[PDB]
């Protein structure tokens, strides 16, 4: 007994047998949609399996991926199977999961299907696929052109054939939470250079896969290119165009309302609950802001009691519809005549990116929940701690550089308190922890760990505690890692917080990934009395590491400028057992964790009152 019929692999297979293509696509989209809802878990997908796999999860998942891969092959190879444009649009949204069905199976990708679509026996390479001239075959091709594809595609040839298929595939290929393999990371690298100029040409999202737009926006921060955020400017323009075309008018600002003493600051949240990254970093500054401003929180039911409680009042957004949510936010700002709009995170919800492309308050502000520029006209100011900033040029907006201690962090609700420190005196093997999300893995980081293992005078074993490595994601991620580090690495799936600390607690040191580094991952490090190396760079998402290490009295040599620098320091920390133990005794004996939880939260509320006053001077 359960809310709703599960998607069935058997239902899917029966449909392909009777050649009921529309039932078959429906069952397939039902299965991918459910996986997408569960971030890769296959609980509540229906399939029979050999009893030997009852108790072996990783092997069950591979069986599932192979059986789905076999079924999708029988379907998409049938030339009698015509795919509608609506079919294709729905598949482009969930290509990330198609990628995993094949990538987590033994088959790696869908290139064997694509080869059946080649009509030119006289072709130079097996990597060149020549298509019959018709829309049907081109959409089947683009849907099955996955991140791990080894088949040639030229974006200029694709663009000139159908802009909408080409645009959709570029969205689909930026959408995965893991894009770390050479094939996937290099498709995405190329897209980020080529696509922004093509995406500007679009007036609406109506013909693109819109429900992965926020993914396109967030995920570009994880490339290495200096100009990697450009796609966000392009996208900001299309969202703006789309929004106006839905009959959106900006708020005409004409009255600053006061509630109790103060003016009103409306706060729009994506994720906010006592164990979420965003509450740990940004809750303290929002509490203290409540002395200068009256605080209205807007959020979904996901936000817990402790999250609602940091606001004078709080309202649930009633549903998923974006136009209704921006209508509710205008009503709120029009009725309270709001002075400031604050989003501590922008980019994790599509609603919040729409909000950053419209006018609701004269002063509109973001923090760095997600540490990237927005390239938006409608955002005046970015809140950020002084020691976190690299170049001011990385940001299209004006920086409000608050003093080092302006955002005192907070422990997770799930944090332990009785933590036994372990300092292994001379370990035979130095266990090296990587606390990272699948987003932060890339060929550069894994080449680097490979080179570290090859030069280290001591045996090293890497332990990856992998956020977002769930269900059908994990086999693919595991093989990516093994392809660089063989038996010298272990890929731990996404685990509950207590279990994730047990994995790190087992380690002797840690390495922060790059280009995009850790924050909450560094609190996790010092929570266990661990030390580690990190890289620094111009972007905030490169510099936070440098900042937090300095806030701990840790030395400059733990912070690298270049990759080669990183490799020397990583080795140094792994070889010199006595030195690393020193650094760990420092962080422990000087309660380093307690110093990250401490500071003056008030400077956000004062600096934003200050800016309203200056604005009010000039009406």
């Amino acid at each position: 007994m359960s809310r709703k019929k599960n998607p069935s692999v058997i239902q899917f297979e029966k449909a392909i047998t009777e050649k009921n293509y529309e039932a078959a696509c429906t069952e397939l989209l039902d299965i991918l949609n459910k996986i997408d809802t569960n971030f890769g878990d296959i609980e509540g997908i229906d399939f029979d399996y050999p009893q030997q796999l009852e108790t072996l999860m990783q092997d069950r998942i591979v069986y599932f991926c192979t059986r789905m891969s076999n079924a999708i092959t029988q379907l998409f190879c049938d030339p009698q199977f015509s795919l509608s444009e609506s079919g294709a649009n729905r598949f482009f949204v969930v290509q990330r999961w198609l990628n995993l069905i094949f990538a987590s199976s033994p088959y790696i990708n869908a290139d064997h299907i694509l080869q059946t679509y080649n009509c030119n026996p006289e072709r130079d390479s097996i990597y060149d696929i020549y298509l019959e001239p018709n829309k049907n075959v081109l959409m089947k091709f683009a849907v099955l052109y996955l991140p791990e594809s080894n088949v040639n595609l030229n974006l200029d040839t694709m663009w000139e054939t159908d802009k909408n298929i080409c645009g959709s595939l570029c969205f689909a290929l930026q959408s995965p939470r893991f894009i770390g393999t050479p094939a996937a990371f290099s498709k995405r690298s190329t897209i980020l250079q080529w696509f922004p100029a093509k995406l500007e040409q679009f007036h609406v999202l109506d013909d693109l896969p819109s429900n992965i737009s926020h993914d396109v926006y967030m995920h570009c921060s994880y490339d290495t290119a200096e100009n990697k955020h450009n796609v966000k400017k392009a996208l900001n323009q299309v969202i703006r165009s789309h929004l106006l075309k839905c009959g959106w008018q900006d708020r005409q600002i004409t009255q600053i309302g006061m509630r109790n003493g103060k003016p009103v600051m409306v706060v729009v949240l994506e994720h906010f609950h006592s164990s979420h990254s965003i509450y740990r970093t940004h809750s303290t500054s929002m509490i203290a802001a409540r002395e200068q401003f009256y605080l209205i929180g807007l959020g979904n039911n996901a936000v817990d009691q402790a999250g609602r409680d940091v606001f004078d009042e709080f309202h649930e957004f009633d549903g998923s519809n974006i136009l209704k949510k921006l209508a509710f936010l205008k009503e709120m700002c029009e009725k309270n005549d709001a002075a400031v709009l604050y989003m501590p995170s922008i980019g994790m919800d599509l609603a919040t990116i729409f909000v950053s492309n419209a006018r609701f308050a004269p002063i509109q502000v973001i923090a760095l929940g997600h540490p990237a520029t927005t390239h938006s006209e409608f955002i005046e100011y970015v809140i950020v701690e002084d020691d976190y900033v690299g170049s001011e040029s990385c940001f299209s907006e004006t920086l409000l550089r608050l003093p080092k201690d302006a955002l005192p962090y907070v422990p997770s609700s799930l944090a332990p308190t009785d933590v036994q420190y372990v300092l292994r005196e001379t370990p035979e093997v130095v266990n090296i922890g990587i606390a990272a999300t699948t987003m932060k893995l890339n060929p550069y980081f894994l080449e680097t760990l490979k080179t570290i293992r090859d030069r280290a005078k001591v045996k090293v074993h890497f332990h990856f505690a992998l956020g977002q490595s769930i269900g059908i994601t994990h086999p693919y991620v595991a093989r990516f890692i093994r392809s660089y580090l063989g038996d010298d690495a272990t890929a731990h799936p996404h685990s509950p917080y207590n279990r994730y600390l047990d994995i790190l607690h087992n380690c002797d040191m840690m390495l922060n990934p790059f280009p995009f580094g850790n924050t909450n991952g560094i609190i996790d490090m010092v929570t266990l009395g661990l030390v580690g190396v990190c890289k620094t760079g111009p972007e905030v998402h490169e510099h936070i590491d440098e900042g937090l290490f300095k806030r701990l009295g840790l030395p400059e040599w733990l912070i690298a400028d270049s990759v080669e620098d990183y490799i020397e320091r990583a080795i140094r920390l792994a070889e010199n057992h006595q030195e690393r133990l020193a650094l760990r005794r420092h962080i422990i004996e000087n309660n380093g964790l307690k110093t990250l939880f401490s500071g003056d939260p008030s400077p956000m509320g004062k600096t934003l009152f200050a800016k309203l006053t200056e604005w009010r001077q000039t009406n």
Binding site: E270, H276, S277
Partner: peptide, 6 residues
């Protein structure tokens, strides 16, 4: 729960 898309 950490920093990723819905």
């Amino acid at each position: 729960f950490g920093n990723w898309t819905t």
